[PDB]
Design a protein around this ligand. Structure first.
Ligand SMILES: N[C@@H](Cc1ccc(O)c(O)c1)C(=O)O
Ligand SMILES: N[C@@H](Cc1ccc(O)cc1)C(=O)O
Ligand SMILES: [Cu+2]
Ligand SMILES: [Cu+2]
Ligand SMILES: [Cu+2]
Ligand SMILES: [Cu+2]
Lengths: 435, 434
């Protein structure tokens, strides 16, 4: 420490590699080689199995966001949210929501790439290194396009293919023709014990949430594994230890789009795809309005801001009803990690979601040049330190925290998105995907 | 070695008179409570894991025992497979749509229970400290196959068993008090080491035809490595199909929404699964033909026979919609093994479901003691051989017959509800009455 966040280093043979749609990428891989898939699976597996005292373990990286609310990279915890409760470093309900998360996703991608290089050095024979290093240097964190209809070989939105597979096949380096089935590190994350009993100070507690005006303590302390919808009130806690990846219910929620906001008076109740379309194409919006639920409290007009859409998708992926609803809403009963700020980052889909939130931000920036922390509301937050993320400042030759202006051009972090490559094409592509 | 496997039930020990098959949730809760020694849960898990890991050429492997019922339609215990139905299609030894449905399945469930008990005794011989073997053996001798009470509200909701919904389960380390080990739960699913369509001949599991909204589909069971509940959806990548998950929330939703496949036009009301089960056990005046099978049937209203309720529960547990349905039915989309006759027995819940179907039969017998293969319709099937199941008779080995298992107690098990016959109508009302 400090861990200096840069994005994957620039290699002249690999100009601005793209973050791809994780379903397109998965099909590309499994149509037509499996080297990037193998690298991602093997590297993330290593990262997930690193110990708690390693701040580049999966648990500690996920820990930056929320619970257990500890230090990271020499930056102390002890932060409080608006309710006065313990909270993480993540920015929610402020205009730095997109930029804090832009750095967070790049940290994750960078840590994964560094683990891929270690993998290659240790497992790929000389004859194969050039090719495998080429693939690592081209790889970027895929995004989950939650607003794009899934292909058939599409009419509905879905969690990623790879997220729904408990096992995945990878290559055996230096044994061309050979493959192995391994547990898929994108399917879930689990510790070796209930997360509530981890050594101090890392234990994950239950998390108090409101449902229909009443308080419930979501039993995340009783989980060994992350779950989607697997936690239900008055179920045996042995079920809670691993409540499953109930991906059919997440898919149901995505297509039923039960927005939590009051849409009384709206022109229509949009689908998730249409709400995303409106976000990207409504004219005349400023950075404050686009970026955060903070801009307009009482909205928590025929369009919804980035953070509010993102909040709904979190709920719909993780499950947002622990207590049993009325009979007419039983089809969506169940709670899980992605709906809960303190523990959502433990679910590996968190990062894929946030990769698309970053992509949506980049699209919006592209077609709203100049709208950046400069309205009357968001200007105060422009120069906030994005703790706990450190970088080396070239000008001054100092270690400093990231600030939002440092990541205004996401290309400075050495990744891009296909959709933002050609500004002559982007408006057509937005209509093709989401209109 | 020319030796038929005789099905007897667990052997009689006079200090263990007619042990009971318990409700699997009660049993699991007891086993995991501080006042229990946890030995039966350990033995069940360890024995069923061994049985599941036996090779295909072992006829007492899980795959081969599940294979008796349906696909891949091979021989078992020297009795030839490769049978064909009326329509000309492959069919297994299982009896469906006939009045021997309950008795064929009574023997099948006993076979499973017996193989498990024998594997428990092997585990004890090899893994338990000498001075604990007598205690562990006595627990094995008390153990019987638990039943899933699909019509009883969980501790108001019907639910799959607690234990069936757990991917992992903690068991004892014999001789090391307080020490437990988490292991893959053999009741959660069954899987092979490859996709089941690629197993060595003659064992490969093929796709299975199903009709949905008037169209034929291939349910892609050949592309599954694991059994699934609801995990097979049309137009999903086949890598999802390899293991489509145990989507137990959807199964529970189906149990409580009870989308009966039958036309209920003219019915006084649409009963829940608990009320339909109540009516099965309490409607008087029915004969064995009417109770036992879909074959008897135009149909009666406000009542359903045993086999028809059982069929619905199969569909609701496994998932019965592969192709995408209409908007209103999206909440129950997805297909899985338990809804398909050829492959349902591979899902470990199959046996727990049939244990309760055996229980419901025993209860009905108890309150209908004079009705047994003795109406005009069912009488002709009474003396059917229940292939492939052998027993010793005259000193010859023969096939089981329905009359050999009229008294289930001859197989050395009982149920709490039938052992206490004096209370039985009050117990049916307390459990299942509205
Ligand atoms: N559940 C939150 C949304 C949310 C959940 C988890 C998160 O990590 C997050 O950033 C936002 C809401 O209803 O508004
Ligand atoms: N699909 C059957 C139900 C069933 C399924 C599997 C079985 O093994 C038996 C019955 C029906 O609709 O009637
Ligand atoms: Cu966040
Ligand atoms: Cu988020
Ligand atoms: Cu059967
Ligand atoms: Cu059955």
């Amino acid at each position: 420490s400090p861990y200096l966040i840069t994005g994957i280093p620039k290699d002249p043979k690999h100009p601005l590699p793209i973050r791809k749609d994780i379903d397109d990428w998965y099909l590309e891989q499994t149509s037509s080689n499996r080297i990037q898939l193998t690298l991602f699976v093997e590297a993330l597996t290593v990262i997930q199995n690193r110990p708690l005292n390693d701040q580049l373990s999966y648990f500690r990286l996920a820990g930056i966001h929320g619970a257990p609310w500890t230090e990271w990279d020499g930056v102390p915890g002890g932060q409080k949210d608006s309710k006065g409760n313990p909270t993480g470093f993540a920015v929610h309900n402020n205009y730095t929501f997109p930029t804090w998360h832009r750095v967070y996703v790049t940290l994750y991608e960078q840590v994964i790439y560094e683990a891929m290089l270690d993998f290659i050095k240790q497992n790929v024979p000389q004859n194969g290194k050039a090719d495998w290093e080429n693939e690592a240097k081209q790889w970027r964190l895929p995004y989950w396009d939650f607003a794009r209809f899934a292909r058939h070989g599409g009419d509905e939105l879905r969690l990623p293919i790879l997220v729904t597979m408990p096992m995945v096949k990878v290559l055996v380096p230096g044994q061309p023709g050979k493959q192995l089935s391994k547990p898929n590190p994108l399917y879930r994350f689990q510790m070796q014990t209930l997360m509530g009993t981890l050594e101090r100070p890392y234990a994950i507690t239950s998390q108090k949430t409101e449902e229909h005006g009443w308080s419930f303590d979501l039993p995340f302390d009783k989980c060994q594994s992350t779950t989607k919808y697997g936690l239900l009130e008055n179920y045996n806690a042995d079920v809670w230890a691993d409540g499953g990846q109930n991906w059919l219910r997440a898919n149901l929620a995505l297509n039923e789009h039960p927005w939590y906001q009051n849409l009384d008076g709206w022109d229509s109740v949009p689908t998730l795809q249409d709400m995303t379309f409106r976000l990207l194409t409504t004219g005349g919006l400023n950075w404050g309005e686009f970026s955060s639920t903070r801009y307009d409290d009482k909205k928590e007009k025929n369009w919804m801001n980035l953070e509010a859409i993102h909040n709904n998708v979190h709920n719909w992926v993780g499950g947002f009803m622990f207590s049993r609803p009325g009979r007419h809403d039983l089809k969506l009963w169940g709670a899980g990690h992605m709906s809960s700020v303190p523990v959502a980052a433990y679910d590996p889909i968190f990062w894929l979601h946030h990769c698309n939130i970053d992509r949506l931000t980049a699209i919006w920036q592209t077609v709203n040049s100049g709208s950046w922390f400069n309205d009357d509301k968001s200007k105060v937050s422009k120069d906030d330190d994005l703790r706990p993320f450190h970088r080396f400042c070239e000008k001054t030759r100092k270690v400093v925290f990231f600030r939002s202006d440092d990541v205004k051009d996401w290309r400075s972090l050495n990744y891009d998105y296909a959709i933002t490559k050609d500004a002559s094409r982007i408006r057509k592509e937005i209509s093709d995907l989401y209109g």
